[PDB]
Curated annotation (Swiss-Prot), chain A:
The protein's role, per its UniProt record: Self-ligand receptor of the signaling lymphocytic activation molecule (SLAM) family. SLAM receptors triggered by homo- or heterotypic cell-cell interactions are modulating the activation and differentiation of a wide variety of immune cells and thus are involved in the regulation and interconnection of both innate and adaptive immune response. Activities are controlled by presence or absence of small cytoplasmic adapter proteins, SH2D1A/SAP and/or SH2D1B/EAT-2. Can mediate natural killer (NK) cell cytotoxicity dependent on SH2D1A and SH2D1B.
Location in the cell: Cell membrane
Residue ranges annotated for the Ig-like V-type domain, each copy included: 2-105
Domain of life, source organism: Eukaryota
Protein name: SLAM family member 5
Naturally occurring in which organism (per UniProt): Homo sapiens
Tissue expression as described in the entry: Predominantly expressed in hematopoietic tissues, such as lymph node, spleen and peripheral leukocytes. Expressed in macrophages, B-cells, monocytes, platelets, thymocytes, T-cells and dendritic cells. Highly expressed in memory T-cells. Expressed in mast cells.
Mod. after translation: Phosphorylated by tyrosine-protein kinase LCK on tyrosine residues following ligation induced by agonist monoclonal antibody. The association with SH2D1A is dependent of tyrosine phosphorylation of its cytoplasmic domain. Phosphorylated on tyrosine residues upon high affinity immunoglobulin epsilon receptor aggregation in mast cells. N-glycosylated.
Free-text domain note: The ITSMs (immunoreceptor tyrosine-based switch motifs) with the consensus sequence T-X-Y-X-X-[VI] present in SLAM family receptors have overlapping specificity for activating and inhibitory SH2 domain-containingbinding partners. Especially they mediate the interaction with the SH2 domain of SH2D1A and SH2D1B. A 'three-pronged' mechanism is proposed involving threonine (position -2), phosphorylated tyrosine (position 0) and valine/isoleucine (position +3).
Oligomeric and partner information: Homodimer; via its extracellular domain. Forms a head to tail dimer with a CD48 molecule from another cell. Interacts with SH2 domain-containing proteins SH2D1A/SAP and SH2D1B/EAT-2. Interacts with tyrosine-protein phosphatases PTPN6/SHP-1 and PTPN11//SHP-2 via its phosphorylated cytoplasmic domain, and this interaction is blocked by SH2D1A. Interacts (via phosphorylated ITSM 1 and 2) with INPP5D/SHIP1.
Amino acid sequence: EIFTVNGILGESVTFPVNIQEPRQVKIIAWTSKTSVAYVTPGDSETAPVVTVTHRNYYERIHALGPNYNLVISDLRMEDAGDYKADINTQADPYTTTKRYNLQIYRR
Amino acid sequence: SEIFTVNGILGESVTFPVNIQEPRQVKIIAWTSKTSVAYVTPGDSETAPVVTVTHRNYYERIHALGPNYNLVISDLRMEDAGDYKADINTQADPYTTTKRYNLQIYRR
């Protein structure tokens, strides 16, 4: 269940979320050692809107549509560790949680 | 700083001291525990801030207080117990400050 993702220092990495087409997302909350960001639905082609909630992450968090895949860019060694998405949707279970372990490599 | 301990009674309310002593500089506060908890942002214009709860465990049970941004978790549960963290994002340096709490819950 804890999915391992590897990223390269100074580059970008994608966290697989892949929200399917019957599910409707209300808000996804991302956390690590600090809160990271909240992601909310975009539009026709506005991609999901991302609100960053710790200064360590400002300008480094992007979200992809329609999957709601998270991209963190300009990776730092300090980004490594456990991440959690609490995915909130209109219908039940209402909240589903996904776990990730990011490891960072200077290459 | 230090972890701050707050005690609460099952079924009741507990208040987390935030004591923002310069409110209108607050952009967003992100509360987490074992799970996500809520975001709190400025009211359009008000005393009072707006809560968006971000996990169903805490649905309808999070309130914030103007003007200090103190947090209330109402209808308390035993699962509510443990370490809480607020990432307070404001308009000027350090831009993010973090407060740590320990919520002890007791029987009704």
